[PDB]
Amino acid sequence: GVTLLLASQRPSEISETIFSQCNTFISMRLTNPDDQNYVKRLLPDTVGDITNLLPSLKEGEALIMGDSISIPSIVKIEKCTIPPSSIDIKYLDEWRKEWVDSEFDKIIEQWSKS
Amino acid sequence: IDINDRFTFSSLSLNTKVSVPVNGNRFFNKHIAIVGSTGSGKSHTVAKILQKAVDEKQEGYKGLNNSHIIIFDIHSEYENAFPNSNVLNVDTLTLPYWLLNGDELEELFLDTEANDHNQRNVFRQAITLNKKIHFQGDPATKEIISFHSPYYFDINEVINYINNRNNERKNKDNEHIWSDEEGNFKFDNENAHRLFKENVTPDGSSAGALNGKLLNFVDRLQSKIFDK
Amino acid sequence: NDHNQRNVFRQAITLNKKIHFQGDPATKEIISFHSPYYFDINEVINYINNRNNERKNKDNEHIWSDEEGNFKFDNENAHRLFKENVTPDGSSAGALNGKLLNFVDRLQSKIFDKRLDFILGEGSKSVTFKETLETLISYGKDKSNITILDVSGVPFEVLSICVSLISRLIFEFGYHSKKIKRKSNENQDIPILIVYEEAHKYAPKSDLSKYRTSKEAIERIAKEGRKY
Amino acid sequence: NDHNQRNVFRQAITLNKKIHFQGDPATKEIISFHSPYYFDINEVINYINNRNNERKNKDNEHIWSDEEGNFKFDNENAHRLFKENVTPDGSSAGALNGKLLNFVDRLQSKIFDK
Amino acid sequence: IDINDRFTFSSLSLNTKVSVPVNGNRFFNKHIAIVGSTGSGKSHTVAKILQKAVDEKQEGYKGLNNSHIIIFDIHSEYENAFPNSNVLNVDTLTLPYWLLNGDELEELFLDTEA
Amino acid sequence: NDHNQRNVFRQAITLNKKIHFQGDPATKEIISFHSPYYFDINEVINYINNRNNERKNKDNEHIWSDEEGNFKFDNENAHRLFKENVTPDGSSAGALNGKLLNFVDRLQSKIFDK
DNA sequence: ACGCGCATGGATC
DNA sequence: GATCCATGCGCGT
Ligand SMILES: Nc1ncnc2c1ncn2[C@@H]1O[C@H](COP(=O)(O)OP(=O)(O)NP(=O)(O)O)[C@@H](O)[C@H]1O
Ligand SMILES: Nc1ncnc2c1ncn2[C@@H]1O[C@H](COP(=O)(O)OP(=O)(O)NP(=O)(O)O)[C@@H](O)[C@H]1O
Ligand SMILES: [Mg+2]
Ligand SMILES: [Mg+2]
DSSP: OOOOEEEESOGGGSOHHHHTTOOEEEEOOOOOHHHHHHHHHTSOGGGTTGGGGSTTOOTTEEEEESSSSSSOEEEEEOOOSSOOSOOOOOHHHHHHSOOOOOOHHHHHHHHHHO | OOSTTEEEEEEESSOTTSEEEEEHHHHHHSOEEEEOOTTSSHHHHHHHHHHHHHSOOOTTOOSOOSOOOOOOOSSSOHHHHOTTSOOOOTTTOOOOGGGOOHHHHHHHHOOOOSSOHHHHHHHHHHHHHHHHHSOOSOHHHHTTOOTTOOOOOOHHHHHHHHHHHTTOEEOTTSOBEEEOSSOEEEOSTTTGGGGGSSOOEEEOSEEOTTSSSSHHHHHHHHHHHHOO | OOSHHHHHHHHHHHHHHHHTOOSOTTTTTSOOTTSOOOOOHHHHHHHHHHHHSOEEOTTSOBEEEESSOEEEOSTTTGGGGSSSOEEEEOSEEOTTTTSSHHHHHHHHHHHTOGGGHHHHSGGGTTOOHHHHHHHHTTBSSSBOSOOOOOOTTOOHHHHHHHHHHHHHHHHHHHHHHHHHHHHTTOOOOOOOOOOOTTTTTTSOSSOOSTTHHHHHHHHHHHHHOTTO | OOHHHHHHHHHHHHHHHHHTOOSOHHHHHTOOSSSOOOOOHHHHHHHHHHTTSOOBOTTSOBEEEETTEEEEOSTTTGGGGGSSOOEEOOSSOOTTTTSSHHHHHHHHHHHSOO | OOTTTEEOOOBOSSOTTSBOOEEHHHHHHSOOOOOOSTTSSHHHHHHHHHHHHHSOOOTTOOSOOSOOOOOOOSSOOHHHHOTTSOOOOTTTOOOOGGGOOSHHHHHHHOSOOO | OOHHHHHHHHHHHHHHHHHHOOSOGGGTTTOOTTOOSOOOHHHHHHHHHHHTTOEEOTTSOBEEEOSSOEEESOTTGGGGGGSTTOEEEOSEEOTTTTSSHHHHHHHHHHHTOO
């Protein structure tokens, strides 16, 4: 009754002993060819042509395979109405404003706490 | 997939009107590995699957279902996705040191390797004895208490045990004699529980088996205890 | 088997960080080995050299004498080993007696290394945490959008630690800025771009030891850096 | 990859470059192991060969005796180990006693080669 | 495979009504390695092999045959697969310490060496 | 790869090469273990065999006896250790006592091998 | 004489 | 490098 959900940023950097036991596989955009070859060999040769769409995947588009799904298919995950607190930083929009005072006293006080 | 075992959290990319359900039992009993580049929606998808598991309730009630999910969240992001959840940090979570079995008691506390056989022995014998002393159940369970038993022991009196045995003094009969408020006694299995306190004064003629050979052991052990 | 030098290394640094702290002494207790607080590195040598000369008595406790007088080596008097003007009184060699001669001799070689003068020089005493961080991102008296790090004709040994420290210091500045803003429900307002020109030097494909400590400094920025 | 052999090599050559410098003291302090200054390799071997025979006393300090009298091995008197005519005087084995003999025999194997 | 050499426990995947017997003498004397991902069915396959080995009885007698199978059960599965079997947990199994052949007697009692 | 056999073999051989060397003294200090000049290997046997008879007195010195007189273990007096007719005088065992017998037996085996 | 204490040493991993 | 162990020498009854 104890299973795992492995969330990792590259398939070729986690140990195979944990990774091989994961029958259910969710694959998002993978620009590394070593990763796409790892997703290639997890598939049969008949459904081996869908992984060519891996580096072209948009945000929220995933490739799901395993005994849970009928066929390995590229799916669009439902948008999170209550999302995690991970918002991308608008670098151009932040840099366009003025120089900030940036409160150095509070940062290194909290840094020294940790 | 049958009607009851369907688990939907996504639709087909080419056809948004086509829903893609997976076998919810087979989705979770066999482990899930979700991978992708940075910004690909991996953390949002993990939260989305966890949310669909939480509201996966059979008809007949309103309260919480039987979902039990533990998140090792290293970016402080999943608190927002689950506002009705319990969030634990190191400053508040308490995982007791006496819940370790034999393997991680040596891994957390002992940094010596391959030449520490007397230091390993006084470590397990202090812990096993202290677990037996604080036990309050039936005596039949008391004697099966061993080194890996998840029972409470005081690591401060464990240090007191190795500190006392660091000053042990044997007599002419090669037996260790101690003195405390109760009186003189001999170090054996029925009296070694009196070494967990620091008001015990050794009495003897010659140095014991561990006299002076545990000073660096206590210093390394007290460093891990006092490490914040 | 380097666990007693490793123990006495952090014990010297953690203690010296507490004595050189002049503030709220509730914070003084949570100062530890990785805390970014000032400690005298020469006083650390004074601690380890004394610990090499230590001598325990019959009771297994190390005794010392300085200009003030005789005292016991415990947590409340370990700060008096930071000066050379101490004489050990005892009947037997202590726990670390004679075990730190090559440890000190190797460690002073790092301090008097002129390659490492920007880190272990006499100028590290005067600067504080705030001045170092404003220097890195040009937040001092003169302000700049671009900070250039002139490491043109510099050896790899001090190039690698320049890269690994500053990449970590900027990352943890970016990390700790986000947690400060998350208390006020705001986002990070200092986005920092670090330019690694001719990155073949410090982050190559090969897995050598001198290539190691600068690879995960850039890997951690590559992996989880854009959140902060 | 012996760090005790590495440390004794640098501390011999750095010290030997100091004693043969004839110049301004401020430049003398910045002399280190990589700095391009003259040192004599025969005295460097003698320093390492002597440090194969160190004998500490009960106060953990190495004591020797050249023709001018007994001395304690410290920063000021470490240049006296460059000469061969030093005899160790102590009770216990020194800090680098017996840890540098394979270092020395290979060191003079390359010097003596024509 | 000879008619007295046949030991069938499986049928072909492409065609159900054809059995795939193996050389039973060659199946068990030459060691068996069964591998597959988690939940593939290795335990059921192992249990089915040992079940067909138990009822592999030559004609002419009643009662259990000369099979001898020892299972190292670390997940407590084969008790229900073999109801008429002997189960030995640590609390009831007694292996004498004087049965050690010296080498294990050397390693059981001394955590030190050399 | 016994370390302590390696050293005594070179102090036997390098010293033996200095005794039999007939050239001018200036190249006697460049004499090493890898220098191609004559040394008598039977005297190398007699050195290592005698060093296995080392006797240490109260003041930590090795004292031998010879036809010419009695001498201590000094580098000048170590040259006369190459003869088999010496007898040790002392109180206790030496530094290399009892650990070079298998080294001598291997060396005698090679030389008396046809 | 023997006992205890301390120091040196080396055996390994 | 540290732990462990043994052998030895010196000072005490
Ligand atoms: N189903 C979706 N549809 C549309 N946009 C999405 C979807 N899921 C996620 N996103 C967007 O993708 C962004 C990146 O998602 P994120 O939660 O950072 O996953 P991530 O790839 O794991 N980030 P990281 O942990 O650094 O690798 C989010 O901020 C959303 O804006
Ligand atoms: N011949 C079979 N036909 C159909 N289902 C089978 C068969 N053999 C096993 N199973 C199924 O396999 C599952 C149990 O797998 P199991 O026999 O435990 O394999 P396993 O590899 O030993 N599991 P694990 O120990 O974690 O590796 C059940 O759902 C069974 O129904
Ligand atoms: Mg994420
Ligand atoms: Mg199984």
